[PDB]
Amino acid sequence: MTTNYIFVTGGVVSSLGKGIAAASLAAILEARGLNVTIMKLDPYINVDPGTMSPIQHGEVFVTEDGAETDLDLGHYERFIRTKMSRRNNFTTGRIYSDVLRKERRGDYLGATVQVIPHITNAIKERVLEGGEGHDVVLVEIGGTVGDIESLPFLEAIRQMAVEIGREHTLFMHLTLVPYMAASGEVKTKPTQHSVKELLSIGIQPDILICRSDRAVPANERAKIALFCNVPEKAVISLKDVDSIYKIPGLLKSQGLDDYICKRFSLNCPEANLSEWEQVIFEEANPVSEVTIGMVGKYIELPDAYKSVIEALKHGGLKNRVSVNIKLIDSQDVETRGVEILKGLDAILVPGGFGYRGVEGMITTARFARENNIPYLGICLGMQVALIDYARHVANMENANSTEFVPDCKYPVVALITEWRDENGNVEVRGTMRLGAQQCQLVDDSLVRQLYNAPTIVERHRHRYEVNNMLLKQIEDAGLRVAGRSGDDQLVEIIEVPNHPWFVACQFHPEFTSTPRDGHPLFAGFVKAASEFQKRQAK
Amino acid sequence: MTTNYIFVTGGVVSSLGKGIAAASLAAILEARGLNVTIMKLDPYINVDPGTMSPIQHGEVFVTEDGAETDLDLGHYERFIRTKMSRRNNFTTGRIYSDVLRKERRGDYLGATVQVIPHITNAIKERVLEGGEGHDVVLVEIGGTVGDIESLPFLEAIRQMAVEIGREHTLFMHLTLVPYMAASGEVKTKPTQHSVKELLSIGIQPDILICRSDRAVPANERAKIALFCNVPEKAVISLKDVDSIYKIPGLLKSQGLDDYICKRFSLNCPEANLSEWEQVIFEEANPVSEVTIGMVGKYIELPDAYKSVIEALKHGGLKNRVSVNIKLIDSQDVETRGVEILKGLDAILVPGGFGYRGVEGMITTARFARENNIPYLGICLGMQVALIDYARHVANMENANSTEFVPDCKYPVVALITEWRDENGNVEVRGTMRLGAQQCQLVDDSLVRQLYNAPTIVERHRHRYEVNNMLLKQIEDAGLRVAGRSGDDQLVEIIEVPNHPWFVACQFHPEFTSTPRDGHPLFAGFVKAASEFQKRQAK
Amino acid sequence: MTTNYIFVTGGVVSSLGKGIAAASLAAILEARGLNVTIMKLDPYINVDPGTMSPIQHGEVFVTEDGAETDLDLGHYERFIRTKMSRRNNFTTGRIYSDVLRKERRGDYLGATVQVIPHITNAIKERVLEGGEGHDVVLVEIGGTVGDIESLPFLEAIRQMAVEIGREHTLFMHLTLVPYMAASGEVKTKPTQHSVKELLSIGIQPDILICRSDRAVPANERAKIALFCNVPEKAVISLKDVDSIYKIPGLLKSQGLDDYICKRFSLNCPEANLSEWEQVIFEEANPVSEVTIGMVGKYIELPDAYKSVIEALKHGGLKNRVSVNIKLIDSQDVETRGVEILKGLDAILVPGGFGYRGVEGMITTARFARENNIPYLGICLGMQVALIDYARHVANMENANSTEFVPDCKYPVVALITEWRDENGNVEVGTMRLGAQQCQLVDDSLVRQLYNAPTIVERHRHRYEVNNMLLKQIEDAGLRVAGRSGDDQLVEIIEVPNHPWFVACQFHPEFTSTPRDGHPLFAGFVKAASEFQKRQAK
Ligand SMILES: Nc1ccn([C@@H]2O[C@H](COP(=O)(O)OP(=O)(O)OP(=O)(O)O)[C@@H](O)[C@H]2O)c(=O)n1
Ligand SMILES: Nc1ccn([C@@H]2O[C@H](COP(=O)(O)OP(=O)(O)OP(=O)(O)O)[C@@H](O)[C@H]2O)c(=O)n1
Ligand SMILES: [Mg+2]
Numbered sequence A, B: 001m002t003t004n005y006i007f008v009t010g011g012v013v014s015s016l017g018k019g020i021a022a023a024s025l026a027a028i029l030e031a032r033g034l035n036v037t038i039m040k041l042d043p044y045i046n047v048d049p050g051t052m053s054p055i056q057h058g059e060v061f062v063t064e065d066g067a068e069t070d071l072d073l074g075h076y077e078r079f080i081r082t083k084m085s086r087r088n089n090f091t092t093g094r095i096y097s098d099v100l101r102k103e104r105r106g107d108y109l110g111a112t113v114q115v116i117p118h119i120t121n122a123i124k125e126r127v128l129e130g131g132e133g134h135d136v137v138l139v140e141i142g143g144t145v146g147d148i149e150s151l152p153f154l155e156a157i158r159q160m161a162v163e164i165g166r167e168h169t170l171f172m173h174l175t176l177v178p179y180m181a182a183s184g185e186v187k188t189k190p191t192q193h194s195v196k197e198l199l200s201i202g203i204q205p206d207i208l209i210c211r212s213d214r215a216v217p218a219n220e221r222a223k224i225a226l227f228c229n230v231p232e233k234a235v236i237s238l239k240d241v242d243s244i245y246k247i248p249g250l251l252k253s254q255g256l257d258d259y260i261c262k263r264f265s266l267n268c269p270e271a272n273l274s275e276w277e278q279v280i281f282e283e284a285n286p287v288s289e290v291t292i293g294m295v296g297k298y299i300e301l302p303d304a305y306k307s308v309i310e311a312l313k314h315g316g317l318k319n320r321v322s323v324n325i326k327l328i329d330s331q332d333v334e335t336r337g338v339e340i341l342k343g344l345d346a347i348l349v350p351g352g353f354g355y356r357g358v359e360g361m362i363t364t365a366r367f368a369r370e371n372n373i374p375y376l377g378i379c380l381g382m383q384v385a386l387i388d389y390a391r392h393v394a395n396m397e398n399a400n401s402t403e404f405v406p407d408c409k410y411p412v413v414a415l416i417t418e419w420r421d422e423n424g425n426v427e428v429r430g431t432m433r434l435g436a437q438q439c440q441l442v443d444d445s446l447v448r449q450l451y452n453a454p455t456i457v458e459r460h461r462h463r464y465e466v467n468n469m470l471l472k473q474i475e476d477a478g479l480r481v482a483g484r485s486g487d488d489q490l491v492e493i494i495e496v497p498n499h500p501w502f503v504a505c506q507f508h509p510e511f512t513s514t515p516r517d518g519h520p521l522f523a524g525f526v527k528a529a530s531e532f533q534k535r536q537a538k
Numbered sequence C: 001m002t003t004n005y006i007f008v009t010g011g012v013v014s015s016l017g018k019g020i021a022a023a024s025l026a027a028i029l030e031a032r033g034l035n036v037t038i039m040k041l042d043p044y045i046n047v048d049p050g051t052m053s054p055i056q057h058g059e060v061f062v063t064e065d066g067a068e069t070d071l072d073l074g075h076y077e078r079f080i081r082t083k084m085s086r087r088n089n090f091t092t093g094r095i096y097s098d099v100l101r102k103e104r105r106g107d108y109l110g111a112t113v114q115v116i117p118h119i120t121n122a123i124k125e126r127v128l129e130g131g132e133g134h135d136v137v138l139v140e141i142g143g144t145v146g147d148i149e150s151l152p153f154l155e156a157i158r159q160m161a162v163e164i165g166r167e168h169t170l171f172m173h174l175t176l177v178p179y180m181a182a183s184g185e186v187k188t189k190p191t192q193h194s195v196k197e198l199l200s201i202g203i204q205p206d207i208l209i210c211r212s213d214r215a216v217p218a219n220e221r222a223k224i225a226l227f228c229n230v231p232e233k234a235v236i237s238l239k240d241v242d243s244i245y246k247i248p249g250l251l252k253s254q255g256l257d258d259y260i261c262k263r264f265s266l267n268c269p270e271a272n273l274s275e276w277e278q279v280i281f282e283e284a285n286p287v288s289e290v291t292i293g294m295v296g297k298y299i300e301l302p303d304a305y306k307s308v309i310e311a312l313k314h315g316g317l318k319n320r321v322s323v324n325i326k327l328i329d330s331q332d333v334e335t336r337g338v339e340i341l342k343g344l345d346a347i348l349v350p351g352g353f354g355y356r357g358v359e360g361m362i363t364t365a366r367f368a369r370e371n372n373i374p375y376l377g378i379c380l381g382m383q384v385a386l387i388d389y390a391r392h393v394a395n396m397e398n399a400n401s402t403e404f405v406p407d408c409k410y411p412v413v414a415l416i417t418e419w420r421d422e423n424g425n426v427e428v429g430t431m432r433l434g435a436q437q438c439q440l441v442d443d444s445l446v447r448q449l450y451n452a453p454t455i456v457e458r459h460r461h462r463y464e465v466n467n468m469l470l471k472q473i474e475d476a477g478l479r480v481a482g483r484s485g486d487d488q489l490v491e492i493i494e495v496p497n498h499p500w501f502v503a504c505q506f507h508p509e510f511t512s513t514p515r516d517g518h519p520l521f522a523g524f525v526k527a528a529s530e531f532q533k534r535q536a537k
C-alpha cells in the first residue's frame, strides 16, 4: 500500500537513454500487475518546453490535458498504459518560478528563502504529487551527476530517501562503459569515478545500469560491484540494441525486476512480456518494404520528429511493412525542385512554425497530389495542403497563412480573430489550442472508415486555423472537409477525394500512437504506401 | 584605465567577516587615491531582503536610492566614501527572476535556458554593471565554498577571470584556522581542504586570508602557501580584533595592498591611514562613560540593530564617551515593569514592525519622558513616543497606530489613505517610503541646531505616518513638530520641549552615520547621556 | 640552459596512449634540434618489471645499461635518439623501497617519515636526476587521475611546478572524448569532469590532448577550453590513427610544439619531420606481402612481443613489404602438429622462460629447417634451434636445456656453472642484462648483414650454450656465427645449407627503430619475400 520510488540518474555523459531505460523498466513492472508511473525532472530554466525550438531538445510532446513537456513523456506513453499529465514533467524554472511567487507574496513569513530547504522542499512536493497513489514511481533526473544544474534535484531525492526510508526507495544509476580499440576491452573506470561523484553528493546507488556498444562481461560487472558498494546481481548490462522493444526482455533476463520487487517486498507474479515479444516478432518478419519521404524544416535534428518517426514504424508493424524513412529538407525542394521527391512511395509533411521552408512544403503537397502519391500532412502539413489546393485548384493566387504573409488577399489559414475574405469583410463579432479534443468525422470519408467511429479524440498544439470565410470556395473546387470540432466548427481533417490516399489533419495523431496498439491513421497511410509501391512495380 | 576585480570568497564556515575584510581592504585602496567600490552577491532566493524578518540575517540596510539590501552594505558605507546603490547587492532570486522574465517573453529565441550560460551570463552582466567605471571592484560572494547555493556565482566569476584576464582579476579566499586546546596549535588542515574544494570548482585562489582567534604564525602560513599554490607573502593573517577600525592597518602592515597594486600594475602612493589611526585613538581615550539602554523587540539577534549600535559608538567617539549599550527586551517591560529601566543614562527605541512588544515601548517612552532621561526614538520609536504623548498628555485614551489596532478612536499613526479623526471624518480626496528624502527643520528646535542647516537628507523605510488629522490636538498639549517633508507635510521629527533631550524621527539616521564623520543626531544624544550621568552623580 | 619539464597525465580511462603521445611530442621537439628526454613513473609496487609475467605486464624492455623497464621505454627509444637508462623509469615500489632503507638506516634522524614530505621529496629527486642536462623533459605519470595509486606522483609534480616556476613547467593532460551513436556526437563531459578532478588535486592543466576514435571538432574543443581554463589553441585533437608514425605530424599541424616553445621561451627552427614523412610513405606503399608466423608461448597477450612485432614491421618498411604477423601458440604445434605451420613465408620463435610450449618450438625449428623456410630465433628461439639441431642432426637423443630437463644426458643449454659433457665430466643469479659487444665470424650471413666485424646488442637471459657439447654439434654441420666475452659464449648460430637460418642470444628487437631499421630483421623480411616468390612460380 505504500508508494515506492526508483530514482533514475545518469553519469559520465548525458545521452545514455535514461528515458528509454526507465520506460522499459516500467513496462516490466506493469506487466507484473503493478500500478506504475514515471516522471521526468528537467534541470533547465524554461518554465516549460513551450518556448523551446524543436531543434534544441527535440519535439515538444503534448499530454492529453494540454501540457507541453519533454519528449521523454512520449517514450513513457509508448511503454506503459498510465496516462501522462502536467505533473509527470517539471523543470527547475517551474520550481523557482513557484518559490519566487510564494516569496514575493509573503508565504514564507519573513524567512530567508534558501536552496535548502525551500527549493528542495518544492522539488519533493512535486515528486510526491506525481507519485502519490501508485505502487511504484520511477523518477528520472535529467542532467549528468556532477554538474551544477542537477544538484538541487539530487539533494531533494537524497532527503526523500531518508524520510521515506530505504524499504521504499532505490537509486538506479546509469553510466557509460566505453569500448577502447586500444585494449579491445570495455572500461569501468568512468563508472567508478561517477559513482564516487554521486556518493560525494550523499547518494549510494543501489543498481548500476551499464551502457555500452556491446554486453558488459561478468568480470567487468564484478569489478564495478567491487568498487561501488553494489552487489554483483545489481550491476546490469544494457548494450546498444537495434530495437528498443527488446530492452524490457534484456532487463528481465538479468533479474532487475526481481531485485526491485524483493527490495520493495512486492509479491507479484512473473512478468508476462508476450506483448513485447509480439512487437519484436512483427518487426523481424516484414513481408514488404516501402520508402516514405518526410519533408520538413527541422531535418537537421531528427528528434524534432521523434513521435512521428515512431508512428510510421508502428504503422509498418500493423502491416508487416518495413518502412524506410527518408528525411528530406523542404528548403531543398525550393532550391533543387521536385527532382529530390522521386522514388518515394508516400510523402509526409509534419508540423512546424515559421515561414522558412514552407514554400517547399506547398510544392511537395502539390507534387504528391498531382502524381497520386499517398500523402499525410500534420498540422503545418495540413496548412500547406490547403494552400496548395487553394492556389492550384481553387484559383486563389498567392493564397497563404497570415502567420507567413499577414496581408495576403486569400488568408486561407489564419487566427480566428484575423478571419477575413478577399474583400476584407469579417464575421459578426494567445489562444493556443493544446491537448485532447473531440473531433467529429464526416460520413463517407477515408478517416471515418479508418477510425471506424463517428467521433475521435486527438491532441492539438497550434494557433492558426482554417479560415472558414474562404473554405466554401475551396470545397466547391473539390476539397472535402473530413472532420470538424467545437462550437466554431473548426476544420480538423481535409481530404482530396480524387487521389488514392490524401489526408491532412490539424491535430498531432503521432502523440497517441503506440507500438502495441498502433494508430489507425498511420496504419492506413503505410498500407497505402505499400499499395502504391506494388502498382509502380510494373 | 581598465577595471580590476577582486573576488572575495569564504571557506570552512560562513561567519568569517567577509564583509568587514572586504570593506577594510577597500579602505586601504581608497586611501591610496584609488576609485574603489564593493558589491555583495547573496545566494538566497528572496528577490531582495525587503521580505526578510530582522531576526533572520539582521537589519535591512537602505541605500540612498531606496533599495533594500543586505547589511553588509552598511559595512561598505562605513569604510569607503563611494555611495552604495541598488547595483551593489543582488540575490540568486533576482537573477532567476530576471532570466525567467526574459524567457517567458521570448527573449532567448527558442533556446533551452540553462544554468550555463544563461544564469551565469546574467550574473556576469550585473557584476560588470556595478563594477564599470572604477579602478578596483571588490566582489563579495556570500555562502561557503563547497555548498550548492553559491556554485552559479563561483562558475560566473571563474568565467569572468578568463575573459578579463589575470592581469585584472584576483581571487581572495578567507578561511578559518582554528585553535585546538589539545595541541595548543592553530590548524591549517581546514584551509588546505577548502582550497582544494575551491580548485575543484575551477578557481585557484591568489590570496588567502586566515581567520583565527589569534595571529597565524609564520610556520603555519608557510605550510598553507606550500599546499595551496599561493606565495607565502599572499597568505595573510587576520586575527580577531577588539575594534574593526584596526583591520585596515593590520592588512596594510602585511603588505596586502602592495601585493594587489603590483598584480594590477597600479602606480599609486602609500596608503595614508591617518583617519583610521584617529578613530582608533579616540576610541582608546575616552574621558567619561555612560550606559544607554536600547529597548526593542528583536534583542535576540543584536544584528537586527547593527547600524544603530554602530551609530551609538560613533556618537561616543565624537564625545570621548565610552558607551555601554544594554539590550533590553520591550516585552520584559510589559511583564516586569520599569524596574528594568533603572540605571540608564539614556534610552533609545529603534525601528520595528508588528504589535508584539510595542506596549512595552510606549511604556518606555513614558518612563524616559517623565523622568527626564535623554531619549531617542527611531521610526517605531517615534510612533511610540507620539502614542505616549497622545495617551498621557493629550488625553486621547487608547490612542494607537492602525498597524496595531486598526479601529481605535485615536489613530495617531496610520497610513495616509486611512487618516481619520475621532469622529470618523476624513480629508477631501503599498506606499512604502524608501530611500533618501529631504526634510525641513523647524527654527528653534533641538535638531535644527544639531544639524545646523535648514534642510537635511535622511533615509526612510516605513509605511505608517503621523496622522495629520489628530496632530494639532497633540501639539496644543505641548508636543513640538521639529521637521516635516514633502507636499503632504508629513511629520519627520517630534520633540518634547520640557525635557533635557527628547527627540524622535521617522527616518533612519543610523544609515548615514560613519565612524569618521559621526552623525550630528547621535553625537547630541550621547552628549546628553553624559550630562545626565554627571547630574545624577550627586 | 634551464631544464623545462612537461608533465603528462591521463584522465577518464587508462589506455589512452600516454607513452606514444609523449614520445611523439618528444620526436617533434627533437626535430627542432632540442635536447629532449622522456621518463615513465609507474604506480605499481613491484620494485621493477623483472619479476612481472609478460602475460600481464607486456614485454620487459631492457635498456643498454641493463635495467629491466616498462615497455613504454621501447616507444621512447623508437621515437627519439636519446638513450634510456635506469633513470628513465621507476615505480612506487622503488620509491618506498628507497625511503624504507634510509629510515631503517637512520638517515631521517628520528623524524616521523611521511608521504609528504618524504615520499614526495624522493619522487622529485628521481625526476630531477632523470631530467637534469636536457632542454625539455617529458614526465609520463602512469595511472588515471582520480585513482589512489598515483596521488603521491601528482602531489610531487605539483610541488615541482611551484618550486621551478611556471615559466619552465607545463601540465599536459590526455582525456577520452567518446562518440555516442545515440546522438552522433563526441562528448566533452568526461573531459570536463576529469579536469575538475585534476584541479581538486592542485594541478591546473595547460594543454588538453583529446583522444577519440575520430577528430574532435572545433565547437567541442571550444567547449572544453571554456570549462577548463585552457585557451582554445592548447586543446589538441588526437584521433585514432592507423599508424602511430603519423602522430608527430598530426600534433605539429595543430601547433602543439609552437605552443610549448613559446611557453618555454625556446627559439628553435621549424620541426623537420621529413624522416617520419618517409616512414609514413614507405608503410603506405608496400610492393608485396608476406605472412610470418610468430610461434611462442605468450601469444595470449600480444604486448608480450611488442618490440619483436615492431621490428618485423620495420623490416617490412625497409623492403617495401607488408608483413602479416600470424601469432601461433607453440602448444598447438605440440597438440595438432606441423600442419598449423603451413602457408608461412617465414617463421620466428621469440624469447621466453620455462618449459611449457618449448617442445612445440623445438618442433617448429625443425620444420623451418627441414623445409628451407626462413627462420629467425631469439633467445629461447636460439636454444630450440640448437636443441633441434643436436637431436636430429648431431644424433644427441633427448638433448635439452638444464632449465627444462635438469639431468638430461645432452645438456646443450645450461648455466655456466652447470656445464658438463654427456659423461658428467666438467671443466677445471648470472642474469646477463644489457648491452654487450659481440664478435661476428667471417663469411657468416650475419657478418654480411651487419656489414661490420662487431656489433652491440642487449641481453636478458640466464642459460648459455654449453661449450662442452658444442664442438660435436659444429662437426655435425652447425655454424657458430658470433661470440662474446672472455668465456667465448655463443651469441649467434647459423645453418649454412638453408636460404636463411639465423638464431641469436641477444634481443635485437630492442635496437630496431622505424627510421633506421635493423640489419637482422631487414634481412629476415627480405628472405621471407624471396621465399614467397619462389613458391608462386
Ligand atoms: N559544470 C557544469 C557545466 C555544465 N552544466 C550544464 O550542463 C548542461 C549541458 O549538458 P550536456 O549536453 O550533457 O553537456 P555538454 O557541456 O554539452 O557536454 P557534452 O560535450 O558531453 O555534451 C547545460 O544545461 C549546463 O547548464 C552544469 O550544470 N555544470
Ligand atoms: N580507487 C582506485 C581504484 C583502482 N586503483 C588502481 O587502479 C589500477 C587499475 O588501473 P585500470 O586498469 O585503469 O583500472 P580498472 O580498475 O581495471 O578499470 P578499467 O575497467 O577501466 O580498466 C590498479 O593498479 C589499482 O591500484 C586506484 O589506484 N584507486
Ligand atoms: Mg583494467
Ligand SMILES: [Mg+2]
Residues within 6 Å of the ligand: none
Ligand atoms: Mg601538524
Ligand SMILES: [Mg+2]
Residues within 6 Å of the ligand: none
Ligand atoms: Mg552537448
